[PDB]
Amino acid sequence: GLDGTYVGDVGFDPLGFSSIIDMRWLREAELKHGRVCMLAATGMIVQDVYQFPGVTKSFGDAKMTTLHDVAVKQGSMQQLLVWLGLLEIFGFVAIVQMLQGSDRQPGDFGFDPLNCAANPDTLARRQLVELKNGRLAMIATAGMLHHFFITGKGPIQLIT
Amino acid sequence: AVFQGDFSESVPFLKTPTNLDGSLPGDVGFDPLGFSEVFDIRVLREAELKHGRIAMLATLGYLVQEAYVFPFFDKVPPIQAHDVLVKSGGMSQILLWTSFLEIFGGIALFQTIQGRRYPGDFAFDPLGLSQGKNAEKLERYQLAEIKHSRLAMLAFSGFVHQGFITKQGVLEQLGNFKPIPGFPEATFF
Amino acid sequence: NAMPFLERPPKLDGSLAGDVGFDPVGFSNYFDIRWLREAELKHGRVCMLGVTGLLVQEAICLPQFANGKTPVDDFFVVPAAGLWQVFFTIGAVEFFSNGFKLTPGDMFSEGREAGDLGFDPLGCGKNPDALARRRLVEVKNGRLAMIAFGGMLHQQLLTGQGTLEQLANFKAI
Numbered sequence: 001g002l003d004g005t006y007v008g009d010v011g012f013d014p015l016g017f018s019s020i021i022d023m024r025w026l027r028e029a030e031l032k033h034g035r036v037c038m039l040a041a042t043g044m045i046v047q048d049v050y051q052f053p054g055v056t057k058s059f060g061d062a063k064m065t066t067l068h069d070v071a072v073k074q075g076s077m078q079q080l081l082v083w084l085g086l087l088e089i090f091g092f093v094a095i096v097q098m099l100q101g102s103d104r105q106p107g108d109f110g111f112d113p114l115n116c117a118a119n120p121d122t123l124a125r126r127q128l129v130e131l132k133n134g135r136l137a138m139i140a141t142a143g144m145l146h147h148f149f150i151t152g153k154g155p156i157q158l159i160t
Numbered sequence: 161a162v163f164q165g166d167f168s169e170s171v172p173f174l175k176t177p178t179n180l181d182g183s184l185p186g187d188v189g190f191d192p193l194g195f196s197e198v199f200d201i202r203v204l205r206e207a208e209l210k211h212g213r214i215a216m217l218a219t220l221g222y223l224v225q226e227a228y229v230f231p232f233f234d235k236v237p238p239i240q241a242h243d244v245l246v247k248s249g250g251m252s253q254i255l256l257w258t259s260f261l262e263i264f265g266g267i268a269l270f271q272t273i274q275g276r277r278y279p280g281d282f283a284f285d286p287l288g289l290s291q292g293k294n295a296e297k298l299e300r301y302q303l304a305e306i307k308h309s310r311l312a313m314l315a316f317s318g319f320v321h322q323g324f325i326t327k328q329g330v331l332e333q334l335g336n337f338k339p340i341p342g343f344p345e346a347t348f349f
Numbered sequence: 350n351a352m353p354f355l356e357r358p359p360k361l362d363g364s365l366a367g368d369v370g371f372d373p374v375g376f377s378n379y380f381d382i383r384w385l386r387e388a389e390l391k392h393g394r395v396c397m398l399g400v401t402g403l404l405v406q407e408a409i410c411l412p413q414f415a416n417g418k419t420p421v422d423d424f425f426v427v428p429a430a431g432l433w434q435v436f437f438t439i440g441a442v443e444f445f446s447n448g449f450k451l452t453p454g455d456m457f458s459e460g461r462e463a464g465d466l467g468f469d470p471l472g473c474g475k476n477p478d479a480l481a482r483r484r485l486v487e488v489k490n491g492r493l494a495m496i497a498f499g500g501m502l503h504q505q506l507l508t509g510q511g512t513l514e515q516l517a518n519f520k521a522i
C-alpha cells in the first residue's frame with residue numbers, strides 16, 4: 001500500500017495503516033496535523049516571550065492548557081472555532097473532491113502567495129521539508145504540552 | 161492549485177461545479193457543496209434573488225428606521241418595532257399584502273420550473289432602466305443585483321447580530337465604537 | 350396581459366367583455382367560462398344594488414320599518430318575517446329566470462348565452478355596438494361593486510359609522 005510516489009516515503013508503515021485507509025486521506029491528514037502543529041509549537045514558544053497588548057490584563061499569567069480554559073470564557077477561542085470551521089468546510093469539500101476523482105493533490109490548497117514553488121524542482125525539496133518539520137513539530141508540541149502537564153511550566157520558562 | 165489542474169475560478173482547489181455554467185449572472189463558480197446538483201439551479205436562483213430583494217430593502221430600512229421614524233409611529237429600536245407593530249397588527253397588514261403578491265409569485269415559480277420564465281423576472285421595469293434602448297445595460301445590472309443582494313444579505317445579518325451584542329444601534333456603533341460589553345474590563349482568570 | 354410574467358390563460362379569449370387575460374390561478378381551465386361568467390355578473394349585479402342599498406338605507410328608512418344606527422344594523426332591526434319573505438321572492442326569481450336549470454350542467458343546456466336573463470323591459474339592448482360597450486361597463490362596474498360593498502360593509506361593522514358619515518369624521522381606529 002506504500003509506494004515511492006508520495007513525497008517523504010521512507011517506507012515506514014509498521015502497523016499497516018496504509019492498507020486500510022486511502023493514502024490520499026492519510027497524507028492530507030499528516031500535512032494538516034503538521035501544519036497545525038508547526039503553528040502550535042510556534043505559538044506556545046511565542047506566547048511565553050510576548051503577549052498582545054491588552055492580553056495580560058484580561059487573562060493574567062495562565063499559559064498553555066490553562067490559558068485555553070480561560071480563553072474559552074473570553075470567547076477568543078470561539079471566534080477561532082467558527083472561523084477555522086468555516087475554512088474547514090471548504091476543506092471537507094476539498095477532500096471530497098479529491099477522493100472523487102479530481103486534480104488536487106493531497107495537501108494542496110493553492111496557497112503560494114510569494115510564488116515560492118514556481119520552480120518545479122524547488123517545490124519537491126520544500127515538500128519534503130514540510131512533512132519533516134511537521135512530523136517534528138507534532139512530536140515537539142506533544143512534548144511541550146506533556147512537559148507542561150507535569151511541570152506546570154511553559155517551555156521557554158522550563159529552559160529558563 | 162499549485163500543481164497544474166483544470167479548476168473553478170473562485171476557489172482554486174475545487175473543480176468547476178457541474179451544471180453550474182457562466183450563463184446565470186454572477187457565476188464566479190462557487191458552489192463548493194453542490195446544491196445545484198441536488199436541486200435545479202434556476203429554482204435556486206429565484207431564491208437567491210428573492211432573498212436578496214427582500215434583504216436589500218431590509219438593509220435600507222434598519223438604517224433608515226434608526227435615523228427617522230414616520231411621525232405616526234413611535235421611534236423604538238427596529239427589532240422592538242416588530243414587536244410593537246405585531247401587537248398593533250401593522251405586521252399582519254404587511255404579511256397579508258406580501259402574501260397576496262407571493263401567491264402570484266408562486267405560480268411564476270411553477271412556470272420557472274416548467275421552462276417558461278427566466279428565474280426572477282417579474283417583468284417589473286416600470287421605469288425605462290434596461291428598456292429596449294437601454295437593453296444593453298440589463299446584463300450588467302443583473303450582475304449588480306446579484307452582487308448587491310449577496311452583500312445585503314450578509315450586511316443585514318450583520319447589523320442585526322452586531323446590534324444584539326452591542327445593544328448599540330448601527331449608526332451609533334459606527335460613530336462610537338466599543339468592544340462587546342465587559343471585554344476591556346473583564347479578566348477570564 | 351394582466352400578469353406579464355405568467356403565460357396568458359388559454360381558455361381566456363378576447364371574446365368575453367373585459368377579458369384582460371387575468372386568471373393566474375387558472376380556475377377557468379378547471380370550470381366552464383360560461384358558468385363562471387354567470388356568477389361574476391350575478392355577484393356583480395347583486396353588489397351594485399348592495400352598494401346602492403348601503404348608501405340609500407343609511408339616508409332613508411321606511412316609516413313602515415325600524416332604523417338601525419348603521420345600514421348593516423337595518424338588516425337586524427327589520428322583522429324576521431321580512432328576511433324570509435325576501436329570501437323566497439329572490440329564490441323564485443332564480444327559478445323563473447334559470448327555467449329550473451339551476452345546476453351547472455343543467456343551466457345553459459338550452460343555450461341562454463352566458464349571464465343573460467333576457468331582462469330588458471326598457472329597451473336599451475336595441476343596438477349591438479352599444480351592447481358590447483354596455484357589457485364591458487357592466488362587468489367593470491360589477492367587479493368594482495363587489496370590492497366596494499365589501500369595503501362599505503366591513504368598515505361599517507367595524508367603526509359603526511355610516512359610509513357617508515365615516516367620511517365626515519374619519520375617526521381612524
Ligand code: CLA
Pocket residue numbers: 002003004005006007008009010011012013015016017018019023026027029030033135136138139
Ligand atoms: C497523524 C500523523 C501522521 C499521519 C496521518 C501519517 C501518514 C503517513 N505517513 Mg507519516 N509520520 C508521522 C505522522 C503521520 N504520518 C510522524 C510523526 C513521523 C515521524 C516518526 C512519520 C514518519 C513517516 C515516514 C518516515 C514515512 C511515513 C509514511 C506515511 C504514509 C504511510 C504510513 C501509514 O500507512 O501509516 C499512517 C500513519 C498513521 C495511521 C499514524 C498512526 C499513529 C498512531 C499509531 C495511531 C494511534 C491511534 C490514535 C491515537 C487514535 C486517535 C485518533 C483520533 C485523534 C482521531 C502515510 C501517508 C511513509 C510514506 O511516506 O509513505 C508514502 C514513510 O515512509 N511517515
Ligand code: CLA
Pocket residue numbers: 245248249250251252253254255257258521522
Ligand atoms: C391599498 C390598500 C390598503 C388598505 C385599504 C389598507 C388598510 C389598512 N392598513 Mg395598510 N398596507 C397596504 C395596503 C392597504 N392597507 C400595503 C400594500 C402595505 C404594505 C405591505 C400596507 C402596510 C401597512 C402597515 C405597515 C400598517 C397598515 C395598517 C393599515 C390599517 C390602518 C389604517 C390606518 O392607518 O388608518 C387610516 C389611514 C391613514 C390615516 C393614512 C392615510 C391614508 C389616505 C388618507 C388614503 C389614501 C388612499 C389609500 C392608500 C387607499 C389606496 C388604494 C386606493 C388608491 C384604491 C388599515 C386597515 C396599519 C395597521 O395594521 O393598523 C395598526 C399598519 O401599521 N398597512
Ligand code: CLA
Pocket residue numbers: 395396398399401402405406409410411414415416417423424425427431435442
Ligand atoms: C343587495 C340588495 C339589497 C338587499 C339585500 C336589501 C335588503 C334590505 N333593505 Mg335595501 N335597498 C336596495 C337593495 C337591497 N336592500 C336598493 C338597491 C335600494 C334603493 C332603492 C334599497 C333601499 C332601501 C330602503 C329605503 C330601505 C331598505 C330596507 C331594507 C331591508 C328590508 C327589505 C326591504 O324593505 O327592501 C326594500 C327594497 C327596495 C326598496 C327595492 C328592492 C331592491 C332591488 C331593486 C330589487 C331587485 C329586484 C330585481 C332583480 C331588479 C329589477 C328591477 C330594477 C328595474 C330595479 C333589508 C335589510 C329597509 C330597511 O330595513 O331600512 C331600515 C328600508 O327602509 N332598502
Ligand code: KC2
Pocket residue numbers: 052053054055057058059074076343344345
Ligand atoms: C491586533 C493586535 C492585538 C491582539 C491580537 C489582541 C488580543 C487581545 C485579546 C486576545 C486574547 C484580549 C483579551 C485583549 C484584551 C485587551 N486589549 Mg488587546 N489585542 C491586540 C491589540 C491591542 C491594542 C492596539 C489595544 C488593546 C487594548 C486591550 C484592552 C483594553 C483595556 C484594558 O487594558 O483593560 C483589553 C482588555 C487596548 C489597551 O488599552 O491596551 C492596554 C488598546 O490600545 N489591544 N487583547
Ligand SMILES: CC1=C(C#C/C(C)=C/C=C/C(C)=C/C=C/C=C(C)/C=C/C=C(\C)C#CC2=C(C)C[C@@H](O)CC2(C)C)C(C)(C)C[C@H](O)C1
Pocket residue numbers: 074075076078079082186188306307308310311314325
Ligand atoms: C463573495 C463575493 C463578494 C463578497 C463579499 C464579502 C465582502 C463578504 C464578507 C463576509 C463576511 C465579513 C462575513 C463575516 C462573517 C463573520 C462571522 C461569521 C462572525 C461570526 C461570529 C461568531 C461565530 C461569534 C461569536 C462570539 C464570540 C466571539 C464570543 C461570545 O462571547 C460572543 C459572540 C457570540 C459574539 C461579492 C458580493 C462582492 C461579489 C461576489 O459575487 C462574491
Ligand SMILES: CC1=C(C#C/C(C)=C/C=C/C(C)=C/C=C/C=C(C)/C=C/C=C(\C)C#CC2=C(C)C[C@@H](O)CC2(C)C)C(C)(C)C[C@H](O)C1
Pocket residue numbers: 190191192193194195211212214215217218219221222225238239241242313314316317
Ligand atoms: C453559495 C454557496 C455557499 C454559501 C453561502 C451563504 C453564505 C448563504 C448565506 C445566505 C444568507 C445569509 C441569506 C440571508 C438572507 C437574509 C435575509 C433574506 C434577510 C431578511 C430580512 C428581513 C425579511 C427583515 C427585516 C426587518 C426589518 C427590515 C427591520 C425591522 O424593523 C423589522 C424586521 C426585523 C422584520 C456554500 C459554500 C455554503 C455552499 C455552496 O456550495 C454554495
Ligand SMILES: CC1=CCCC(C)(C)[C@H]1/C=C/C(C)=C/C=C/C(C)=C/C=C/C=C(C)/C=C/C=C(C)/C=C/C1=C(C)CCCC1(C)C
Pocket residue numbers: 421424495496498499500502
Ligand atoms: C348574512 C350576513 C351575516 C351577518 C349579518 C350581515 C352582515 C347583515 C349579513 C351580510 C353578509 C355579507 C353580505 C358579507 C359580505 C362580505 C364580502 C362581500 C366580503 C368581500 C371581501 C372582498 C375582498 C377582501 C376583496 C379584496 C380585493 C383585493 C385583494 C383586490 C386585489 C386586486 C386585484 C385582484 C387585481 C388588481 C390588483 C389588486 C388591486 C391588488
